[PDB]
Each structure stands twice: as structure tokens, then as C-alpha cells.
Enzyme design. Sequence first.
Site, PDB file in Angstrom:
ATOM      1  N   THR A  36     -23.695  24.370 -22.416  1.00  0.00           N
ATOM      2  CA  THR A  36     -23.695  25.793 -22.768  1.00  0.00           C
ATOM      3  C   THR A  36     -23.344  25.998 -24.241  1.00  0.00           C
ATOM      4  O   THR A  36     -24.025  26.736 -24.971  1.00  0.00           O
ATOM      5  CB  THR A  36     -22.701  26.557 -21.884  1.00  0.00           C
ATOM      6  OG1 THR A  36     -23.048  26.385 -20.502  1.00  0.00           O
ATOM      7  CG2 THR A  36     -22.699  27.988 -22.235  1.00  0.00           C
ATOM      8  N   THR A  37     -22.294  25.323 -24.712  1.00  0.00           N
ATOM      9  CA  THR A  37     -21.869  25.546 -26.087  1.00  0.00           C
ATOM     10  C   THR A  37     -22.918  25.086 -27.090  1.00  0.00           C
ATOM     11  O   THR A  37     -22.980  25.629 -28.193  1.00  0.00           O
ATOM     12  CB  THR A  37     -20.530  24.823 -26.324  1.00  0.00           C
ATOM     13  OG1 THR A  37     -19.542  25.375 -25.443  1.00  0.00           O
ATOM     14  CG2 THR A  37     -20.078  24.965 -27.796  1.00  0.00           C
TER      15      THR A  37
ATOM     16  N   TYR B  20     -22.893  19.218 -13.888  1.00  0.00           N
ATOM     17  CA  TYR B  20     -22.354  20.192 -14.842  1.00  0.00           C
ATOM     18  C   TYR B  20     -22.228  21.483 -14.058  1.00  0.00           C
ATOM     19  O   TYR B  20     -23.217  22.186 -13.838  1.00  0.00           O
ATOM     20  CB  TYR B  20     -23.272  20.331 -16.051  1.00  0.00           C
ATOM     21  CG  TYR B  20     -22.875  21.284 -17.141  1.00  0.00           C
ATOM     22  CD1 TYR B  20     -21.537  21.441 -17.521  1.00  0.00           C
ATOM     23  CD2 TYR B  20     -23.829  22.002 -17.835  1.00  0.00           C
ATOM     24  CE1 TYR B  20     -21.182  22.298 -18.526  1.00  0.00           C
ATOM     25  CE2 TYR B  20     -23.496  22.849 -18.860  1.00  0.00           C
ATOM     26  CZ  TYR B  20     -22.175  23.008 -19.210  1.00  0.00           C
ATOM     27  OH  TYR B  20     -21.839  23.845 -20.240  1.00  0.00           O
ATOM     28  N   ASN B  21     -21.023  21.768 -13.571  1.00  0.00           N
ATOM     29  CA  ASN B  21     -20.797  22.944 -12.738  1.00  0.00           C
ATOM     30  C   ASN B  21     -20.296  24.099 -13.592  1.00  0.00           C
ATOM     31  O   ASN B  21     -19.212  24.034 -14.168  1.00  0.00           O
ATOM     32  CB  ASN B  21     -19.793  22.651 -11.622  1.00  0.00           C
ATOM     33  CG  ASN B  21     -19.850  23.681 -10.539  1.00  0.00           C
ATOM     34  OD1 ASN B  21     -20.922  23.981 -10.012  1.00  0.00           O
ATOM     35  ND2 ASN B  21     -18.710  24.260 -10.216  1.00  0.00           N
ATOM     36  N   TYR B  22     -21.105  25.138 -13.722  1.00  0.00           N
ATOM     37  CA  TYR B  22     -20.745  26.323 -14.502  1.00  0.00           C
ATOM     38  C   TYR B  22     -21.238  27.528 -13.717  1.00  0.00           C
ATOM     39  O   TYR B  22     -22.316  28.074 -13.984  1.00  0.00           O
ATOM     40  CB  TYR B  22     -21.342  26.271 -15.906  1.00  0.00           C
ATOM     41  CG  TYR B  22     -20.739  27.266 -16.888  1.00  0.00           C
ATOM     42  CD1 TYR B  22     -19.622  28.024 -16.555  1.00  0.00           C
ATOM     43  CD2 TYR B  22     -21.288  27.445 -18.134  1.00  0.00           C
ATOM     44  CE1 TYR B  22     -19.081  28.915 -17.444  1.00  0.00           C
ATOM     45  CE2 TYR B  22     -20.768  28.346 -19.029  1.00  0.00           C
ATOM     46  CZ  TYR B  22     -19.665  29.082 -18.686  1.00  0.00           C
ATOM     47  OH  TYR B  22     -19.139  29.970 -19.590  1.00  0.00           O
TER      48      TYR B  22
ATOM     49  N   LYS C  35     -18.337  17.785 -14.356  1.00  0.00           N
ATOM     50  CA  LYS C  35     -17.650  18.630 -15.324  1.00  0.00           C
ATOM     51  C   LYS C  35     -17.581  20.029 -14.717  1.00  0.00           C
ATOM     52  O   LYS C  35     -18.614  20.694 -14.542  1.00  0.00           O
ATOM     53  CB  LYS C  35     -18.368  18.622 -16.668  1.00  0.00           C
ATOM     54  CG  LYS C  35     -18.407  17.240 -17.272  1.00  0.00           C
ATOM     55  CD  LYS C  35     -19.269  17.173 -18.523  1.00  0.00           C
ATOM     56  CE  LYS C  35     -20.591  16.482 -18.238  1.00  0.00           C
ATOM     57  NZ  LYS C  35     -21.371  17.179 -17.171  1.00  0.00           N
ATOM     58  N   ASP C  36     -16.371  20.471 -14.344  1.00  0.00           N
ATOM     59  CA  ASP C  36     -16.182  21.720 -13.596  1.00  0.00           C
ATOM     60  C   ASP C  36     -15.707  22.776 -14.582  1.00  0.00           C
ATOM     61  O   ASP C  36     -14.510  22.851 -14.893  1.00  0.00           O
ATOM     62  CB  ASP C  36     -15.183  21.520 -12.458  1.00  0.00           C
ATOM     63  CG  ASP C  36     -15.222  22.611 -11.431  1.00  0.00           C
ATOM     64  OD1 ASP C  36     -16.226  23.371 -11.339  1.00  0.00           O
ATOM     65  OD2 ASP C  36     -14.225  22.736 -10.667  1.00  0.00           O
TER      66      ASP C  36
END
EC number: 4.1.2.55
Lengths: 293, 293, 293, 292
Positions: free
Chosen positions: C42-43, C129-131, C154-155
Site C-alpha cells: 500500500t505505501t 498481505y492482510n489489509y 503481514k497483518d
Amino acid sequence: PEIITPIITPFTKDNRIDKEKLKIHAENLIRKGIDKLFVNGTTGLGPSLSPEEKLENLKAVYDVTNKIIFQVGGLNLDDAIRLAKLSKDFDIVGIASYAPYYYPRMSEKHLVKYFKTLCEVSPHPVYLYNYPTATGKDIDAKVAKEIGCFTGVKDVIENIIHTLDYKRLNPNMLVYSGSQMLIATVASTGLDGNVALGSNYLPEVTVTIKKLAMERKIDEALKLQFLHDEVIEASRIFGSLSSNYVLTKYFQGYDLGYPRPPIFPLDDEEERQLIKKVEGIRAKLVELKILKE
Amino acid sequence: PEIITPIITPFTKDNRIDKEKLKIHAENLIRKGIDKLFVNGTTGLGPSLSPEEKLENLKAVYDVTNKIIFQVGGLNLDDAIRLAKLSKDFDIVGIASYAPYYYPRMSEKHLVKYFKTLCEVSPHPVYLYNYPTATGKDIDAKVAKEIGCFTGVKDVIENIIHTLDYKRLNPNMLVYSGSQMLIATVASTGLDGNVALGSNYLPEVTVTIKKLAMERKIDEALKLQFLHDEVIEASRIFGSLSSNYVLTKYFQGYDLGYPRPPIFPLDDEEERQLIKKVEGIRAKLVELKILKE
Amino acid sequence: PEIITPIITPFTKDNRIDKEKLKIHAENLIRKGIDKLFVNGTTGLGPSLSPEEKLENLKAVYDVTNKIIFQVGGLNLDDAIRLAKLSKDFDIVGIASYAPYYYPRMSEKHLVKYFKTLCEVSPHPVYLYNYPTATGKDIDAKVAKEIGCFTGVKDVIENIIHTLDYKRLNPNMLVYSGSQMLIATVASTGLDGNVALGSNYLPEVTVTIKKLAMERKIDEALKLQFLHDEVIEASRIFGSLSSNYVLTKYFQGYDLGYPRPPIFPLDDEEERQLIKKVEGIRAKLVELKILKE
Amino acid sequence: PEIITPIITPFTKDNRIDKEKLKIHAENLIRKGIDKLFVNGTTGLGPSLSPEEKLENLKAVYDVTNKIIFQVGGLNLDDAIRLAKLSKDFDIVGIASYAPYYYPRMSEKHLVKYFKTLCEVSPHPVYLYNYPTATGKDIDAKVAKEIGCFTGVKDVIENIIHTLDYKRLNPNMLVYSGSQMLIATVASTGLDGNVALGSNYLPEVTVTIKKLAMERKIDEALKLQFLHDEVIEASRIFGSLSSNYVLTKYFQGYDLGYPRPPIFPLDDEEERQLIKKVEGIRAKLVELKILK
């Protein structure tokens, strides 16, 4: 098509129900063409009332009319049962309950059991009061069918297909929308009417929109719908449940006392600002001959 | 009032747009009375299409009709600008964009600037495609007024007062509801029409509900609305965006290929289960003379 | 206990990836002690990047370091498969994907099938990649176990029990928290590290908090945690994804170019206001010997 | 740091508070190392109790301990004021209130005024009971600072940075997390303790995790945390607030009666399935010498 007013509960400065102001308000609503009065709903601060106080409200309005739906729900099922039983001596339209509020993650089986218990004790038809934004629970058309014992539903949600689903899945059920959009719900779209959150202070507008809608004078109804919506928006500036008191006094010309803290009354400056926001709407409604000067 | 179909994008088994099936489908929709086709919307898997594919869809549908609203949005504003400019050579209804999706907590200023940039470059009217449950952002009537350059809005939400707010605050804007409740929104409630999510596979039902509603044959329109709603419910069992393909083949009689993974195609068992759920509806629609056996 | 930086993608004024600025940034992060670089998160504006751009980012960082997790996900599974296969020639830590975003109401079956497809083709370990705030979907510990092929997760969530659940139900999985509270997740609570949202612009703070937390100097780490949180809050004034560029230039001393609209760059006045908000924090960090002046 | 138990309210079969089972429960919790008892919280079915019953609960627990935080809130501010004033004659730790529940879209001004009113009449320190999922309202660190009169906050939320924000913006405030993750909140992260929603039925586990954590024995603490988490997951099968009664009886060996409908009791069959789900956890805790 029917209009149901979720009637306000007037309180005194001592934070007790003002029975005389409640009587005056109920009389005016019936005189202005409202079909039925829904007592101890959200607008009437139902969850802020003890069982005794819920019963007081019934008695005060019943002196005036028997076109009452009596909301009895709460978080002590024994008290809801006792109110349901006490209603036997009142020749009213029905009792009602919202879903149990506050507690998250309540099982469907427990929610169904709550409502089935009320049905088993009720001396009157039972109405579902569905208000998901306040209760955190949605008792949708499928769950209502599973409960199996509702005579009607008041679906206080802006999602209109959600409301029509009740009629599709329960064709014998009376189904009322609490949508702000009266034109599309009150008549001619499959529903039985509207629980009209703004009808406490402008019942003339609600009733006229209903009539115009039934006549298919949609352009004329829209003009009034939009004035109604401008008042709704203004009421949200300082809190709609508190603003309803100021607006009823302004538009209907009698005092409705105070709300119950923590639904705090508008202070003097807030009241003057709210009136400034709606005084042009009042003038327009007088010009349109909806309100008297 | 007008019906807008958010048209399906047919893909081949090897994940390419099937231009010939798209043209067959577009022709059928127009022939069955759909007013306009909305290309690269959610139903068309717009976000799953490259900008080159979004243009490929426009070109295919334009061989059939110029009554197209061309969705061009995305997270690369330069690509959306290019698509908007490429559309100059097509005599279409307008371009459209959803709000920037995925990223949370985007400023109102940046959302406004995104849309104003598209307006500054567009050779056609610009439509707001409002789909908050997918984009995570709401571009409401007030923000639309601030942006100031929309010719219309497609408000894909069940909250009908939210849609009416656009017309109240922007009286010259074309305002379309994406509500499932056609019988309320298509006609006689102050909107310009409906973006009908189920009209790919039963355009006859959508158009007939509109006709019946405009004629005030509400009981007849309601029976068809309910049949439509039963199909929409069945489509949710396995995923509506995937089920749309199977349902169009079943009700309209031509193949529309596959969706694009991760919008996975229904497998053969799922197709048969879905058909079993709706075959009685089809028989009823044949009995009612809405469809041909 | 590792720190993973979700590295920023620098763009040129022409809206292309600035390879040289990306290389310089990656070199600085490794030199300041960041353990691994997560590319196209995201970043890094992952969803704003074409597949080819995602691959460009991998190549630019890989010149510098092989300590990479390569995010490849998107709404065209074939492209994600392509990228997974193209990674085979890079000796990196793993590939990753977020869940399919935008489309609401996707079935668990389809979400599981998406990730299992990536696992089947991947030449590297696969990381979840959990977002959920960005994708609208939560791939929780139970669904991760059902998928069954993740090497790590990655939570990116503030719900710390949610993150621990992955380790409880998947004891052999590497589990990283994306919580803003580094002090509670970077060490001594059963997790493998933190994906540190602010480590682009203050890697020294992130790394120092880590070391202080291991040395049981929680009073000292808290003070830096608080300064870190004040910078996070200031970054939200104008938009955190955009502010991260200004903050990296201010604290690290080199230019990181532009974001990709609709993630709009801060204008010169917004930059001035943001720097004033964090000026005193930088002075304190210099006084504390964490940054050279 | 401290463990606070949001203590269950036992009811009789005919839906009256069972004062003698409550006293037995309170005495056990204190004996097993719980630092403070939070009375009339969500776990105690506070919103299901009349103001008269809220006071009854205080009086019963006060017979056992003065280490009480007394929750008094509700939708009639006059009743909350009365309860706050009635508490003067009880030598307790503080009173508390959740934000006004049910009504949506309440203004910050009105929320602030509610809490400042309670502070003005309270004879004891006032604690914020922040539970956004139940009340629909978040009284965050900024609003708490604006209110300006809280001695402490109990932040019942899994978002741990949200809880730390209270300490950052209000350095003198006591700050407790209601997170399920004890091992991150009971020590060494800047917080004053944990409001532990599983400590009614396994206070030994909660207190032991706190000890191990303080002793830096994170591996052993983690094993207990996971067993605690498995029981919590099992409690959700038939309803956590209802299951807490069955679990306390099973793990602590005394009867705690019934919840208050519409928090319905588990039936005999539901009770058997829940016990079957946690019987292996009990055996393990016995082996580990956590339980006897």
C-alpha cells in the site's frame, strides 16, 4: 397508505413525563390526519424510559386515541412481558419491540427466542420495530419469517429493498418504511405506509405528501419532500432527537418541554440558530397554504 | 425515465474479451428496450480491465449503439485522462468514473481534484459513478455540487434518500438510482431512471416493470419485481458477478463466456444448482408472456 | 524480531517510476538497519502500478538487496501469475498478495482459490498481505489455515489478537504485525516483527525502538514511540501516503519525487505546514542522538 | 500492572440477583490474585440491570472487598447521578460509566456534558469505560482529554495503539486495555493493566500470564495465552456472555446461576457440547499445575 408518527415524549424540568403536553401533542397529531401513534420508539426516547414510564406514556396517549402501537422492549425480558400483559386492558392496535440492543454478537437463536416469547404472552398483535443503526442487529425479512408471529414491521432504514423483502417473504404482514423518502414509500410501491420521523413537527407536510403521492402529483409532492428534507438536515446540526422539541414548538405552536439527558435540550443559542435555518421554510409552507400563518 | 444496463464483459476461456459475444449481448439489450449501456462498470468488471481493455470494450459496444456511458476511472489518473481523450472520436452519452478505490482516508480535496481533472479534459459529459460499498468512499450530493461539473450521477446504493439528495442539491443533474427496487425508483419519485443490476439477464422484466409502473399497474409490477428479486437472491448464492453469466445464457439463450478470475466462473455443478433455483421463475415468466418458451 | 519497510515508490513529474531515487532510498534503509523491504505494498502504491511497473520496482530494489518480499496481487489473476513466474530469476525472500480488492461480497471459496492459485505457480515462499481496511476482506487465521500454503503473513491491522491468532492456528507461519504500536509487537509478544509504516522516513526510530525494546528499556522506547506517533498524526493532516514523501525528504535528506495521482503531492504550502508540525520532533530526535543534525 | 475482572452477575432461576453466589465468586477471584473487580460492566450485564439492581450488586461485592470500580451509567442521567452519590458511603476505588448507548449520532458536546456531569457529583475517582462496539460511540484519548476529569480509562477494544493514545495525551491517567491479548497488555508496554474478560472462569490463567510476562518468560506465557484464547473461541459457539456462566462453573467448581434473558442460558445440551470443547484444555491446565 398510513402515516405512523413515532411520538415524542415531553419531559418536565424535573425529568418526569409531562402528561398534559403529551396529551396536547397526540390530540394535534390525530386532528392533523396522522393515522396511528407509535409510543416509546426511538423518537420518544423509549430506551431511556423505565417500564413504568413506558406504561405512563401509553396511558396518556390512550386517553386521546386507541390508534396506538405500544413499544415494550428492553434488556429485561421479564419487564417486556409484564408490559405486554399490562397492555391487555387497552384496545390498541398492537405492541412492538426493537431487538435487544447494546450487547454485540447475540445469536440468531437468542434473538428469535426473545421475539417468540413476546408473541406467546401478547394480548395484541405484535409488531417488529427494526432499527439496526441503533440496536446493532438487523431482524430481516427471513428472520421475521422464522419468528413467524409478527403482524407488522416498521423498518427504520434507508434501504428500501430491505423493507420490500418483508412483504415478499411475508405477504400477509403489514410493512411500513421509516425511510426519509416519503414519496417513494408511503403509497404505490408495495408497502403499507411510513413511520415518519419528521411528522411530530410537520404532520401537515407528511399528510400532504401522502395525499399528493396517492394522486400521482409527484412534482408537487417533491417540492414538499425537499422542504421536509431541509428541515431534517437542519435538525441534525445540533442533534435531531433534541431538535425535534424545538421544531415542534416552532411549527405547531405549543411547548413540548425537554428531552431526557443525555439527550440534552438545545441551549438558547442553538435554538435560535435552528429557527434561523428553518424560518424561510416556514414562510414557504405558509405561502403554499400547508401551514396557517 | 430511462433504464441503464451496466453491461457484462464476456471473456473467453483464455481470459480475453469476447467482442463478438459482447456485440450479440449489446444488440439484444437494445432490442429489448434498454435505453443506455454503461460500459466498464462494476458488473462489467471495470477494475479488472486494463485501460487498453476498457477502450476495447467501448469500441465493441459502439459497433452496436452509441448510447454508451464509458467508464474510464482508475488509480492512474493519466490513464483515465487518456481514455477520456480517446473518447472524443465516439459520439457517446458521456464518460464516467468511480471514486479512487482501495486507498483509505483519502482527503476530500484530493477526491475533488481527481474528478475536476477528468472534467477539465473530457470531450463529453461526465458522470459520477457512486458505489461506496466497492470504493470505500462516498461522493455525496454535497461533494458532487462542490465538484460542480457532473452532468449526471449513478448512485449504486439502496439508500434512496441519498440518491434524491443529488436532485435536491443539483436540480439540473441527471440522477439515476442503482436500487434493486425498480418499482419505486424507475418512475414517479423524482429521479431520471435506474441503473438496473439485473437487466443483463432479464431486460424484459426491467423494461416491463418500468412500463407497468408508469401506467400505475402496481400490483402487476410488484409480481414481476418479486420474481426479479428471487433471481437476484439466487444469484448471490455463488456470487452475483459470476452468476450473471449463467443467468444471461439461461434467460436470454446465448452464451456470454466467463468472468475474469478472481471473479471465478461458476462450475458445472454450481450452474445446475443455480438453474434449478430459477427454472420455476422462468416458467412463470413464460406463463405471464414476459418471456418466450 | 525483524522490521520490514513497505517501501515508497518514487515517481517522476512524468508519472513514471524514478529508478534512481528508489535505489538510493533502498540503499539508505538497508544501511540504517531495516531487515527486509516489502515492494508494491500500500505505501508503495501497489494497486496504482501496472504489472510491468510492479516488476520494475522489484528490479530496481534487487540491484541493491535480495532481502525483498515482492507484492504481485491484483484483479487479473493471470497477471499475478505472470509476475509470480517472472520472480523465479530473483533470489528473494518471497512473493506476496493482498486479497482481491474493490468487489464486495466475494465468496470464501473464490478468495481461497485466488491464493491457492498463486501458491501453485509460485517459485518462492508466498506471504499473505492482510489489509482489510483497504481490500474490504479479512483473510483471518482460519482462512489462512484453509489456504494452507502461506509461509508468512503481514497483518496490517491494529487488532493485535487478530495477528496472534495466525501464530496460534499456524504455528510454523512467520507472523508480522502492521500495528502502529511497535513497542508491543516488535519483540516479546510472540510475533516475528513489524511492517513499519513510518520506517520510510524514520528508520532510525523504528530500529532504535526495536533495540530498546529487546534491552528491556521500555521507558526509553515509549518516549520514541510517542514521537513516532506524533509524526504519524501529522502525516494524516494532508494525507499520509502523500505526506510520506515530504517526511522522507525532511528526515532523511534526499528527494523521493512525487506520488502517483490521485495520491496527489502536497503543495508547497502544505509541505511548509507539515514540516512546522514535525520541526520540534526532529530537534528532539537530534537531541536524543537518534538523528544527526 | 493490574488485572481487573468485569465480574459476572449471577441470577436465580426467577431472574433475581443471587447475592450469595456473587459473594462466593468475588471472594474466589480476590483469593486467586485478581486486583480489582469491575461491577455492572458488559460481562455483568450492566445495561440489563435497573439502577436499583446496580446498587444491589455493589452492596453484595462490597461485603467481600473494597477493591471495586462501580459502573453506574445509563440513559437516565439522574439515575447515574443518584448512584454516584449513593456510592459516597462505600470505600471503593472509583465509579465508572460507559458512553450513552443505543442512540446514534450523538454530538461530542452532549457526550462530554454527560461525563462532566458525573465528574461534578462523584464522591470517588471517575473511570471511563470505553466500549465502542457495544455503545456505538468512541470516547477516544482526545475527547477524554477534553472531558478532563477521568482518573482512568478501561479501553475495551483490540486496537492497542488506540489505548496507548490515552497515555500519550493524558500522562497522569490510569490506562487499562480490554484486549484479549493479555501477554502484550499486562506488562511492559506502557499500560497500567488489563480488563480481562476471561478472568471470571480462569483467573489462575490470567494471573499466571501476568506473572510470567513480568518475569520475561514469554514462551510459557504464550502457551497459556493460547489455551485462554481457545476457551474464548469456544465460548462464542452459543454466546459468550451466556457461556461465561457454564465455563465458570466448570473451571472454578461453583454454580453461578443464570444470565438474564435476552441473554439466555445455555440449555443442558449446549452445556454438554461446550464442556466437551474445553475438557482437553482443563486437563492440560491441570497437568501444567495451573488448576487442581
